């Protein structure tokens, strides 16, 4: 009903200062796969969570931001070294945008056929980002839940909203599978899922890479499906 099309992307306002960006890529056995990230206005700047699949699509995200918000993009954080999350890093860099990822994502990105972020996040033992490594993140609350979908997957809550972003760790409350497990940590996936849920106990809107936003039943149901792996 409320989704705004812009070229080949889709933008959905989730909250006063928060939009979901969605881009698509054909893959065998799936069709044209939606990948979601976030756009957050924080005062006079914009923050991005995840690229689109490609440079061109990512440049279109920046064009939408220019048209609809018309404020500088201060930074992007990208939530692991796969194409749906880091495929457009060159577009961000060309645009002069500072980029952040888990240290491990930056380490894996070259061999994944991806471009590393410019800055590395590190995490306390409890999984909260070390705040000095995430300067100017404003309302973004970055959390490493443990290895799951990938060894390097991270998650993002938004202060002052009921939104938490699971990226490709979380699936929707009616999801059939855990999707791509080629890089999954089969032993630990199950626990990582429930850690995300625990880190963001108040969030009623669970946003994720490959489904529309859902209730926390997404977390309960993802944890459940994961339990069957270990
Ligand atoms: O693991 C999934 O849920 C998944 C399914 C289809 C495509 C991609 S990129 N992912 O991560
Ligand atoms: Zn992935
Ligand atoms: Zn994915």
Residue numbers in the entry: 41 to 270
What does the paper say about this structure?
Crystals of the NDM-4/Compound 1 complex were obtained from poly(ethylene glycol) 3350 solutions at pH 6.0 and contained one molecule per asymmetric unit. The model was refined to an overall R-factor of 20.3% at 1.3 Å resolution. Compound 1 functions as a bidentate ligand to Zn2, which is also surrounded by the side chains of Asp 124, Cys 208, and His 250 and the bridging solvent in an octahedral coordination sphere. The bond distances between Zn2 and the sulfur and oxygen atoms of Compound 1 are 2.5 Å and 2.0 Å, respectively. The coordination geometry around Zn1 remains tetrahedral with the side chains of His 120, His 122, and His 189, and the bridging solvent serving as ligands. Both the side chain of Lys 211 and backbone amide nitrogen of Asn 220 serve to anchor the carboxylate moiety of Compound 1 into the active site. In addition to the difference in coordination geometry to the binuclear metal center, the side chain of Asn 220 swings toward the active site upon Compound 1 binding. Within experimental error, the distance between Zn1 and Zn2 when Compound 1 binds remains the same as observed in the apoenzyme model (∼3.6 Å). In the NDM-4/Compound 1 complex, the bridging water is within 1.9 Å and 2.0 Å from Zn1 and Zn2, respectively. Our results demonstrate that Compound 1, an inhibitor directed against NDM-4, demonstrates a unique binding mode, whereby it forms a bidentate interaction with Zn2 in an octahedral coordination sphere.
The bacterial metallo-β-lactamases (MBLs) catalyze the inactivation of β-lactam antibiotics. Class B members, known as the metallo-β-lactamases (MBLs), are structurally distinct from the Class A, C, and D enzymes, require one or two zinc ions for catalytic activity, and are not inhibited by currently approved therapeutics. One variant of significance is NDM-4, first identified in 2012 (17). Although it differs from NDM-1 by a single amino acid substitution, namely M154L, it demonstrates increased enzymatic activity against the carbapenems and several cephalosporins.
